[PDB]
Amino acid sequence: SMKIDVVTIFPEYLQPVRQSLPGKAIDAGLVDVAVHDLRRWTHDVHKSVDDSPYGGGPGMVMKPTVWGDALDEICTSETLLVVPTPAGYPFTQETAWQWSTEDHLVIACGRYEGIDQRVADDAATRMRVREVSIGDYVLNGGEAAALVIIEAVLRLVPGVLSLLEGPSYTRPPSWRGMDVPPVLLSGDHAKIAAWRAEQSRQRTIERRPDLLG
Amino acid sequence: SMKIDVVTIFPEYLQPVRQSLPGKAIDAGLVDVAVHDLRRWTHDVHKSVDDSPYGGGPGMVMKPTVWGDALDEICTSETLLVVPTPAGYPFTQETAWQWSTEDHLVIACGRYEGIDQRVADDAATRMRVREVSIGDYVLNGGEAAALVIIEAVLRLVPGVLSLLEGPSYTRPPSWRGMDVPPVLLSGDHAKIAAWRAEQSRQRTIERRPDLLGFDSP
Numbered sequence: 534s535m536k537i538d539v540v541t542i543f544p545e546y547l548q549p550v551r552q553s554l555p556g557k558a559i560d561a562g563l564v565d566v567a568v569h570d571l572r573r574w575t576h577d578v579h580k581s582v583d584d585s586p587y588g589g590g591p592g593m594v595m596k597p598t599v600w601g602d603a604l605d606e607i608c609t610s611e612t613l614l615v616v617p618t619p620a621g622y623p624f625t626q627e628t629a630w631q632w633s634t635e636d637h638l639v640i641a642c643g644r645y646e647g648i649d650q651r652v653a654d655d656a657a658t659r660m661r662v663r664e665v666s667i668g669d670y671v672l673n674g675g676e677a678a679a680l681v682i683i684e685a686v687l688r689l690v691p692g693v694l695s696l697l698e699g700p701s702y703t704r705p706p707s708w709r710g711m712d713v714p715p716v717l718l719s720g721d722h723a724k725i726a727a728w729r730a731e732q733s734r735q736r737t738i739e740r741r742p743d744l745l746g
Numbered sequence: 747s748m749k750i751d752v753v754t755i756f757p758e759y760l761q762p763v764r765q766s767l768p769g770k771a772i773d774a775g776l777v778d779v780a781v782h783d784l785r786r787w788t789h790d791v792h793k794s795v796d797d798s799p800y801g802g803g804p805g806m807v808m809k810p811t812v813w814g815d816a817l818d819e820i821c822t823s824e825t826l827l828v829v830p831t832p833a834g835y836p837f838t839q840e841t842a843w844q845w846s847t848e849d850h851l852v853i854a855c856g857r858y859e860g861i862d863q864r865v866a867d868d869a870a871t872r873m874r875v876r877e878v879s880i881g882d883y884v885l886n887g888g889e890a891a892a893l894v895i896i897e898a899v900l901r902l903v904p905g906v907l908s909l910l911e912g913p914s915y916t917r918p919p920s921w922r923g924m925d926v927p928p929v930l931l932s933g934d935h936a937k938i939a940a941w942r943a944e945q946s947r948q949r950t951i952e953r954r955p956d957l958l959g960f961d962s963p
């Protein structure tokens with residue numbers, strides 16, 4: 534059983550991933566994904582979630598008082614608090630494997646200017662906190678990153694949801710002047726394995742030379 | 747303005763594009779985002795988009811005929827065709843800046859084991875084609891990658907408008923016995939700039955030592 538709680542000011546962003554979960558998995562108690570509007574924990578008639586940064590500069594910083602109350606309600610001692618941010622440790626396939634065996638993920642989606650740092654510092658005194666970046670680019674908010682993390686983690690949970698892969702082919706054998714490589718039709722399975730290893734080597738050199746050293 | 751066409755067998759997965767800054771860019775007429783069901787280009791009862799691979803292997807490959815016909819209708823010679831795949835070139839901030847100036851992006855999202863290589867190779871005879879990875883992890887399909895690419899690009903388009911950002915703070919100045927760093931309360935612009943620069947470099951070397959030319963953990 535995995536429980537995922539997402540806290541966002543855009544709860545509608547998450548609805549399609551919730552609906553996509555198979556009934557079988559949910560009915561088997563394998564997974565539960567809940568989405569919470571952060572404004573439920575606001576203090577004021579204006580439902581304020583952010584405020585001007587100390588030390589000045591542009592942008593707004595999300596309020597520690599609101600986030601503090603939300604995580605007090607949603608988190609437990611067992612929780613892994615995930616905070617998507619461009620300033621985070623890299624989220625990789627290794628992370629997704631590690632997190633696929635967690636009982637309770639809480640994903641705190643903020644604006645890219647960020648959540649007051651005391652929220653993560655306070656939470657780390659009573660649970661595990663992971664600030665993570667999904668890649669080498671800035672997003673306006675954590676919601677699109679939350680969708681990537683949920684998908685990367687849940688596809689590794691049974692029943693729920695090195696070199697580059699080389700090119701793939703299916704019927705027909707000739708299409709707009711382009712033939713499927715005839716080795717693939719040869720029935721020499723050792724030779725096909727060697728051909729695919731060479732295609733993966735060439736592709737990795739071209740696209741991701743960092744992966745070879 | 748900019749046109750974005752997304753082609754998917756799960757058009758419902760793209761609805762989040764109507765939220766947050768992409769939603770605001772759409773409402774303000776700076777971008778038009780159209781989402782198309784690939785199954786619109788099938789001609790059979792079962793509306794089949796996949797078949798077993800040549801050469802063997804697990805799973806299914808998306809058929810070239812259906813993609814060919816979709817991209818013939820949606821794409822022109824001016825189109826940048828974006829194919830999200832874990833086997834792609836890295837998508838980075840520099841890519842987002844470059845694509846922010848494009849008139850027409852088409853995002854072809856494939857699930858299963860991927861799309862026939864001949865779809866990208868054929869499109870590349872007529873238009874610019876970019877196979878891109880948004881990061882070193884595997885997804886079930888290109889739809890979540892498409893939302894990441896759209897968000898990363900649209901926040902840069904004129905009309906909306908290295909090192910890690912260090913920590914940020916707002917009121918109150920003391921919370922649960924935790925104080926905002928005194929320099930940020932001091933009103934000294936040069937000490938604040940100095941402390942923010944140091945915090946950025948210290949976070950970068952802890953979290954992303956690769957950005958400063960050091961070995962990853």
Ligand code: NA
Nearest residue numbers: 814817818869
């Ligand atoms: Na085509």
Ligand code: NA
Nearest residue numbers: 814865868869
């Ligand atoms: Na094509």
